[PDB]
């Protein structure tokens, strides 16, 4: 039941700088992010419930992402998560984990939610970085398509109907977000 609205909004300004988003469309975005997060986390736990300490690493998230996300979304998400981890382990006023990874989505909060749900409890620092990049990539893809549909319909604000056009008319987003 978590809110990523401020991060979803910052991502929106990156792909569509002069486009807004309605409050109901923002609720739907949050549902997308929460649903994908829960599914990715539940499988990352199940895959790490069988090693000794049960420690969710960047590599468990990577495998859960390959399983949950379809085809090309999976390849691009894995690309994004890999780059975020590499930039994060390469990185150094104290800079937040999200900005060290070059991300808008909140690494620290996702670490807390991962550690909390006891999904194979013990979480490595790379895992929220990778997962934040995956959810941010998915948010950016949806927002890009929904923004395009919005100003094709002569609007400057993403409405719920622009999200459904973005999702249902994209083969892989539709398979990923069908149950939501």
């Amino acid at each position: 039941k978590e809110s990523y609205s401020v991060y979803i909004y910052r991502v929106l300004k990156q792909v569509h700088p002069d486009t807004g988003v309605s409050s109901k469309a923002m609720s739907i975005m949050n549902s997308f992010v929460n649903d994908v997060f829960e599914r990715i986390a539940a499988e990352a736990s199940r895959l790490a419930h069988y090693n000794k300490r049960s420690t969710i690493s960047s590599r468990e998230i990577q495998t859960a992402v390959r399983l949950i996300l379809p085809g090309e979304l999976a390849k691009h998400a894995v690309s994004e998560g890999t780059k975020a981890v590499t930039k994060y382990t390469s990185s150094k006023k104290a800079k937040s984990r999200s900005s060290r990874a070059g991300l808008q989505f909140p690494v620290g909060r996702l670490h807390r939610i991962l550690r909390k749900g006891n999904y194979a409890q013990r979480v490595g620092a790379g895992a929220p970085v990778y997962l934040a990049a995956v959810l941010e990539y998915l948010a950016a893809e949806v927002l890009e398509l929904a923004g395009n549909a919005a100003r094709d319909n002569k609007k400057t604000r993403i409405a719920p109907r622009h999200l459904q056009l973005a999702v249902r008319n994209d083969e892989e987003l539709n398979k990923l977000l069908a149950g939501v």
Binding site: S3, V6, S23, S96, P106, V107, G108, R112, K116
Partner: protein
């Protein structure tokens, strides 16, 4: 002490210059003693202002509990500061009045769990317990120097206590054995409160198999404070500071979530 950033420079200093640095160390100790008096006066200032803050917090508790009704001047305050006229009127129309809903349910639970530091301490089995929290208050003292935080719970099936008290004892003087540390008031002791749990409700304890009783994760270990012992106390104190300095004075901003952090 040999970890100092500029040790090699210090070592190379000629002796007559070294003695001047020593003089500066002695003068620095005197500065810190004066700083200690400053913090004592600030602590008294905080005590003085408790009476000034009290009425706003009382009125807030009465509103949260449903004991008093909002005035017209109160009703005309925007529920969220950020909104424009149009969007605000929508928001007020999104859900009709419900006369069976008294006060503001889950106010303190929502406020506490929206703060990222306190959210770290809240487990899911703590959530229904914190639903019974009706008020959170704080007060400071000169004798013994420190402050307390009190958590008021309505009658509930989890424990019998009606007030859970957390007390911090503070040292305001520089440590005679390390005077140059002094960074302000520092915790001597934390004193919690014994929770009188109803049968089978103690989420702070679990057994593992000899059969031992070990600590389970829960917000309510906040009321059982402590070579690791210094790591717990500092993070316990910092959570206490957050509640006293940040959450209590600005509770409704955490309830609405208008105060955010980017960890």
């Amino acid at each position: 002490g040999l970890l100092s950033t500029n040790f090699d420079m210090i070592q190379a200093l000629p002796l007559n210059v070294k003695q001047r640095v020593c003089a500066l160390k002695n003068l620095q100790m005197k500065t810190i003693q004066i700083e200690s008096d400053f913090y004592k006066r600030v602590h008294e200032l905080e005590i003085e202002f408790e009476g000034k803050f009290k009425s706003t917090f009382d009125q807030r508790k009465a509103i949260v509990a449903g004991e008093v009704e909002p005035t017209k001047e109160q009703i005309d305050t925007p529920i969220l500061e950020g909104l424009e006229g149009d969007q605000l009127a929508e928001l007020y129309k999104a859900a009709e009045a419900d006369p069976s809903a008294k006060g503001i349910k889950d106010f303190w639970l929502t406020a506490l769990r929206t703060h990222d530091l306190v959210a770290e301490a809240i487990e899911e089995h703590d959530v229904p317990i914190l639903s019974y929290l009706t008020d959170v208050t704080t007060a400071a003292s000169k004798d013994p120097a420190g402050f307390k935080i009190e958590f008021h719970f309505a009658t509930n099936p989890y424990f019998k206590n009606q007030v859970l008290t957390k007390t911090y004892l503070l040292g305001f003087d520089p440590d005679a054995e390390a005077p140059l540390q002094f960074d302000g008031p520092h915790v001597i002791r934390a004193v919690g409160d014994t929770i009188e749990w109803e049968d089978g409700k103690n989420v702070t304890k679990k057994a593992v198999k000899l059969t031992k009783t070990v600590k389970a994760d829960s917000f309510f270990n906040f009321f059982e404070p402590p070579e690791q012992a210094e790591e717990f106390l500092e993070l316990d104190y910092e959570m206490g500071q957050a509640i006293r300095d940040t959450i209590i004075p600005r509770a409704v901003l955490f309830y609405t979530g208008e105060l955010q952090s980017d960890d």
